[PDB]
Symmetry: D2
Subunit: 474 residues, 4 copies
Amino acid sequence: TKQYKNYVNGEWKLSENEIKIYEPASGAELGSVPAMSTEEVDYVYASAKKAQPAWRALSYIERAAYLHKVADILMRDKEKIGAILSKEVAKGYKSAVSEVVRTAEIINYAAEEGLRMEGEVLEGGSFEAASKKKIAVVRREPVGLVLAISPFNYPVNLAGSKIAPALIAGNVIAFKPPTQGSISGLLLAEAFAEAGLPAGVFNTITGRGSEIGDYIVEHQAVNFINFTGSTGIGERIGKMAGMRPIMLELGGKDSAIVLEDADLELTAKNIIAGAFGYSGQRCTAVKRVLVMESVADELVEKIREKVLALTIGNPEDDADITPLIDTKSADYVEGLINDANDKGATALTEIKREGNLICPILFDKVTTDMRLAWEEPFGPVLPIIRVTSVEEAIEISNKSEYGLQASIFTNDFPRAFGIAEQLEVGTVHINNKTQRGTDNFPFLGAKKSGAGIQGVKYSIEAMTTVKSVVFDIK
Amino acid sequence: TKQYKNYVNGEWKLSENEIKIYEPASGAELGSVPAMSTEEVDYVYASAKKAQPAWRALSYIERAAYLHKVADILMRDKEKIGAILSKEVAKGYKSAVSEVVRTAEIINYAAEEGLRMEGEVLEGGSFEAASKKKIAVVRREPVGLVLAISPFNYPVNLAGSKIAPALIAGNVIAFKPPTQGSISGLLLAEAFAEAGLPAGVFNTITGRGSEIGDYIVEHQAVNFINFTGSTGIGERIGKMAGMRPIMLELGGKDSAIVLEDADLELTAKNIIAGAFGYSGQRCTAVKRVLVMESVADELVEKIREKVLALTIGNPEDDADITPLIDTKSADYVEGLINDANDKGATALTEIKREGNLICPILFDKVTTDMRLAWEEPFGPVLPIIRVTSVEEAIEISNKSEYGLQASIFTNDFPRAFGIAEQLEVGTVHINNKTQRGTDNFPFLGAKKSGAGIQGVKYSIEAMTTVKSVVFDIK
Amino acid sequence: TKQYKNYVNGEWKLSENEIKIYEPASGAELGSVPAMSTEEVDYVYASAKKAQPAWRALSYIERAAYLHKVADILMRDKEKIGAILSKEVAKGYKSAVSEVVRTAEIINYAAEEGLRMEGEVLEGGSFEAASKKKIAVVRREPVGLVLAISPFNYPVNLAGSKIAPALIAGNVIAFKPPTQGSISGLLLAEAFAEAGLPAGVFNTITGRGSEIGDYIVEHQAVNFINFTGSTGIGERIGKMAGMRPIMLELGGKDSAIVLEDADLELTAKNIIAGAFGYSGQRCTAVKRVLVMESVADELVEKIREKVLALTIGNPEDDADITPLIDTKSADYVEGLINDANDKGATALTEIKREGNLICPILFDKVTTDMRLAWEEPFGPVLPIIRVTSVEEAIEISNKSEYGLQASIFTNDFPRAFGIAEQLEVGTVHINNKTQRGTDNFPFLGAKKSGAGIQGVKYSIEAMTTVKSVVFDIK
Amino acid sequence: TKQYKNYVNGEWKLSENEIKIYEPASGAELGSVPAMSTEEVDYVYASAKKAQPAWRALSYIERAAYLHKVADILMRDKEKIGAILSKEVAKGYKSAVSEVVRTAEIINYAAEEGLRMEGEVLEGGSFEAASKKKIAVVRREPVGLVLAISPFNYPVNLAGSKIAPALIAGNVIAFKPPTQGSISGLLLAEAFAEAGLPAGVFNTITGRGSEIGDYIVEHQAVNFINFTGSTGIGERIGKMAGMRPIMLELGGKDSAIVLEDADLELTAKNIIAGAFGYSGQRCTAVKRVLVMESVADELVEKIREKVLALTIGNPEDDADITPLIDTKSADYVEGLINDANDKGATALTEIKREGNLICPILFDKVTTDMRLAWEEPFGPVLPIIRVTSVEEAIEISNKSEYGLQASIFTNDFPRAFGIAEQLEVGTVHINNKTQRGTDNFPFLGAKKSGAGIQGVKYSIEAMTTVKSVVFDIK
Ligand SMILES: NC(=O)c1ccc[n+]([C@@H]2O[C@H](COP(=O)([O-])OP(=O)(O)OC[C@H]3O[C@@H](n4cnc5c(N)ncnc54)[C@H](OP(=O)(O)O)[C@@H]3O)[C@@H](O)[C@H]2O)c1
Ligand SMILES: NC(=O)c1ccc[n+]([C@@H]2O[C@H](COP(=O)([O-])OP(=O)(O)OC[C@H]3O[C@@H](n4cnc5c(N)ncnc54)[C@H](OP(=O)(O)O)[C@@H]3O)[C@@H](O)[C@H]2O)c1
Ligand SMILES: NC(=O)c1ccc[n+]([C@@H]2O[C@H](COP(=O)([O-])OP(=O)(O)OC[C@H]3O[C@@H](n4cnc5c(N)ncnc54)[C@H](OP(=O)(O)O)[C@@H]3O)[C@@H](O)[C@H]2O)c1
């Protein structure tokens, strides 16, 4: 079998055991990845803590140059990495190549953002005359060893979104990709290896999170945990973190509030784009439409027609709708579809599943009584919930324990801004679908959608600390 | 008995049960405080979540005006509050009045700092040309309901340091003082009552943390936990917080590194000041001296003479050394004193204890083998540890699991700055004893000394979130 | 005669000559103000440069406390100062009292903003690895002696808007009010006297700007010139300043662009409010309406009716329209009214003048061929210019050499934001009349409307410099 | 003759007249540069104003990409450009190549700094409750057409230091190099031509500043003037600028204050380095030593020995001391040398001049009575002025009308910081010679040394304005 290895302390290492990866669309074996032992995890961490001081001792610009090299390498090999990524997570080929490209972009942005974090000089005289000669020189510092964990839908992108901001500031990294997507995670590891960062600065970990995950997170050598994945695991990590700092990017159930003065055609296209992207396997995605009854029939018919225009098929054919990541996922979605249907929702699209490929389905007349109204499906299923007032829309929206983003389709901005203030979310997009879009922008979620604020600059600030040196001037 | 009441939803409330408070120096009953039931805790929280929206709806300036009123009231009644505080925690009278004064100051500072937190407008064109018409309007928002918990040595000051920054930003408060110091905490509550903040915006909780503490922290109505106290409880809270945000100010074992070119007299006075303040019952306090052998004998003799000049007695007499907060504390300190002595340390001061009053004691020749070298005593005991190199001083320093602050006494600044970079602490004071000093300055601890960065501006930033609204310009 | 005196170096001083002030509405003598000699100007300046070092030596908080005292005094005596201000510049009584109140507010805000200006610590390693041990500690510093000059329509408010930001930062002040409004300027001086600022820190100058103005500005002892007044004098000062820093707030001819989807009633009320405030004697005031022909007739009739509802009379009666500041002004306005009329504009309101009181007049069908379309009148005359496209509105708008503010009345925000980007002005108000409104907001003008950016924070930044101290860490 | 051309609106243009350039060391003709007519100046400006809108319409990243191309090209041709620059201004070859390299660096830094300038969102509720629904979205904007003028000692570097920061923000450029150094200025122009920026965005102007200088500055099409050169011309421009914004980098007479606890050897080397660099033809250069009498003899002898180790000769031989830019300059320096000598100063080095090459000379016993103590020579002549107290050193220092930078050599930092506060300069270097060093650091001068604050970030902020859009949220 094609056995991939972990990058540990400047070397590539296999383990006594391996995990075989298959393509979610065909079942074909892709290769295997190591199933690390806790002793091997200990060595990755011991390696990193050892290398940190010297990494931190480099100049900011030297660290940015290393990262620029990594990004340059990713661009060079984007078709290579993209071909395997496409196969490993059953995501269209072109979009797979786009993930790699977006990764290089965030690595290059974090590299230039990080060498520009400034410190402050504060005056004691601002607080008390007696301390007017006392000044504080405050400068940032790395937290130490950061553990980064990416999800299956963006194993590379959502790894680089953590690695670059961490490294530029002087921290060292321990990266653990998702098992289904670990081969791609190791292909990214190759770029860091070629760029030539000092041994121990960047390392990878592989094994089933359901088996060594608690171990790698509870390990006291870990100073910070940056995670992207399910709410349930985030809750776990939040506790396993203790008083240690963390950044969680969890579930989302983004709602699209459509008022009566919205451009329905523009609204229909955005909802379709955000709802069915990557078969609905996106955290920031319109997962429920709360529309005003008076415009609902018209919006729904447009959405209905558009759903029928989506392509369905294999990743290599760049189909809009591809097979879900695994059988358990497709089964879970089916149960949501069933609960809705059996409960009276109106399926405006055919319910059909072949293997783990579920055709896109539009559900009208969904009520707050159906599971599909609240639970994140992570499949191509979109519920339409008709409301009779903006206040109800807000009520139903905020009712969710999720609060990533939201879209408001209307032409009344001052009103749209008033609504946005009440929406318990991180970002509100006016007349656009939701998105992490433009990584210089803050990215955070409310309630059980996460902890911490991301976006390049915020990530950097979050994974650094401060060192205040106070003295008196004579 | 003089029964104090909790301030809940605009009203003062007693509970079926009470807890009687005594003066640590005389044993005299001071009065009693309610022992709230979990049902009463639920009502405090339900009251606050209900009042939050309307409080958040006020203008920043309106909220600052309320807070300026509270501070003004504290200044007016500073002798009143200070007389009881002095008695409740056996701290000198004048210093007790100073705590109240310092509280008013931080309340007034946080009030003016909070109405000056600005948002940002970001450009999509910074990241990608295609999103050049996309801009992000980012504005801050409260986290919701904040639970504040102060320690016994600063029940008022270290409560106000949490309440003001929280309220100015729109958050609502649930304040729980320490049982020994709860009467004073309710005297501060009186100021918020007189200032007239809306019912539910500010409330207090009382009962033994060892009994209802886990309950008030685990309560899902709580959105943020700001705590000041022991490491053990902080660890607890860190876990009980889940993925919820928290700010912990825990233990410290501040070291004073004395190089060979230090002004020994100036060094001796600072160490004495920071080491014996409030009988060593201060978190930011020189708790261990790591001095260069060649200057050790001279520094120790000065410190020895100065220790003998300290006054010992009752809080009402403004004595330097007053009785420790309680019997268990005095006993714990005595064991530290004993371990050191039996192990060979050189007591340069008489070991004497009367009741819970422990005379100040200087220990020379302390080794890393004695408990006193590592454990936070919270008593008037100072260990002197002689080193033979700056590298050893740093080694022994960083060896502690504590990392609040540190002092470096030397006349070589560039070198002092190089050392400060290696010291695993929050703040490094050059030629001054450690201190939270000047609240506009950041205040944080490394390792097990805490989580989060305080100081007025940082507190505010920490207890707020962000709301990003993205739209496109045509 | 009631002879007012200048506050010079802690003392009040008369001059050999005086200038008698009369009430613009009745002609009644108000008192007299000194007509300083250049030698007296030299002493004010010598006094200030002498006092600066010690003022700069105070703590920020000490300087903010002085300013808070001044504001508190202004609030106490607001009816007193307002009664004379109302009489000196023929402005309604209540609005006069409001000027004083607004002054206290900006003095208090600048006081709290100034003790919060922070410095920076920069890394050489951001630019070059070789300089990675080199850090820069950058801290702000006063420019020195600032000369402040207020206009007749806001002699107190627009003096305090310069004095407070200057003083908080450590600068010393030389204040020169307008001759017509100098008595009120000296009443403000009284507040600084009572607050007890050190001798020389704050002083006043009086005499006709047309006679000693060039002298006080060209004086080399002056380090910065902050001026509010006419464009012609601003141009002058710009040149007399040399390479010295200045801040000019000059003329304005604010346009109100009314698109076809505007709420005409809300638009009509805002235009009326901003156009006729203080008889049109305001810099930030809608001075020309560029409306879409299709909605023009309707908007004009509303505006016509509202103009007729305005009150006309004496300041003491709080009339909307009061007598203009002087005869030359009323004559100038009349000529504008005449040029328009003789040229064919449609006067929808009666042309009437009594003394120097000019009734409000609305002119429809104004063309770019009439003086009234371009020249700032500073009288109750409003021209309506009908356009046929948004592009023409922008063309005609930007055609003016003035660029203070602008209002856009429309319900299309993305479009409104696109237009705002093309308008050559400082601030663009959407669905509101123009205004300096909320002093924490930036206030600046484009083209010949000024130099520099104001608003509290910006004023402070503008009247301070930086001191960079660079050293290497070993 | 080799006739260079100006880059105007995407094309290279000669003029009817030309100016022949010769090498200051050999007299050899280097080529010729156009002597533009005012009509040609008008076309350069008309071209730029025409191209600005579309340049401003590009995305920030697109503009940074153009600039990165220019820098990359400069690096590629650094030996080429450096060979001619070395010959045109008689500066060593390797240092000439270093100027080009440093230019690319500042162009690349400004490019990444500029796409990271953020805007702000301000709340009306911070100032008044009534405006709590009113928010201000403040975004930066270019000033328009910027006129950049570099000096002869850094025609390329100090051109790029103005061009890049200007362009990245959306401004267009009109660049005018010094006549002696115009050929090199046009070689830089070639890089902007090859990078392919749109026609009109970047253009050059050539002709004698003494003949067309006033014209190009007074031209109303110019929105901002960024100049580096003599104080006399800066004064001129300051006036010709009117109320228009400008940035002036003028003369300097940097002093090196040497206290009694300084490391004399380290001090001697720095003074030599900063004083004799480029034959003393540097603005930021130790131009006068104010040393404590007790350490003066020792410091002077060290400096004396080192001066004798400096190399003297031709630029191509990379000599330390090369021929001065021109005859008038050498004559001027000679007069300073003469005034000092005839007045009693002690020349510790031989006074010798061949052609325009003046050997380095050290003058001890200089007094405040000699011209050399105050006037900027721009030649290899260093005066030593012995003082008897730190207070006198400060007095004599601040006595100069110059205030660029200063060095303080001492081991007492708190004291050094106190002195730095009193020194009327832009930057104070502790134990290092003065320097513009590390372009991310602020660079400004006090008194007659300039106007405005430079350093990448500050340059960008200085050549941009703000556009505030205010609306209310419903
Ligand atoms: N908000 C955002 O920014 C964001 C972005 C994209 C996706 N997501 C969310 O992610 C979910 C889909 O991703 P997923 O199914 O890959 O998530 P998941 O099941 O929570 O797992 C994601 C990652 O966590 C690991 N993991 C599992 N148990 C762990 C343990 N206790 N300790 C440490 N790590 C552990 C996995 O390793 P294994 O693969 O071996 O189990 C993997 O690296 C959705 O909820 C979606 O909304 C969030
Ligand atoms: N780092 C800093 O900024 C800072 C400042 C000052 C002091 N300190 C630290 O605080 C300690 C001394 O103060 P302390 O003895 O008051 O600390 P503590 O015994 O840890 O208790 C602190 C506070 O926690 C409450 N509490 C106890 N257990 C609880 C639990 N189960 N869950 C939630 N709340 C509970 C207490 O109420 P009850 O009294 O009813 O238990 C009290 O208000 C030292 O370790 C010291 O250095 C830290
Ligand atoms: N942009 C803004 O924020 C702002 C605000 C309000 C008004 N304005 C503008 O100001 C004008 C109306 O105000 P105004 O009549 O007070 O203006 P002005 O006649 O130009 O005078 C302004 C001030 O300058 C003084 N002065 C006259 N000549 C001077 C000189 N050569 N040197 C130094 N000072 C001199 C005056 O004292 P004397 O009384 O002795 O002449 C007065 O204090 C209008 O054009 C208006 O739009 C601008």
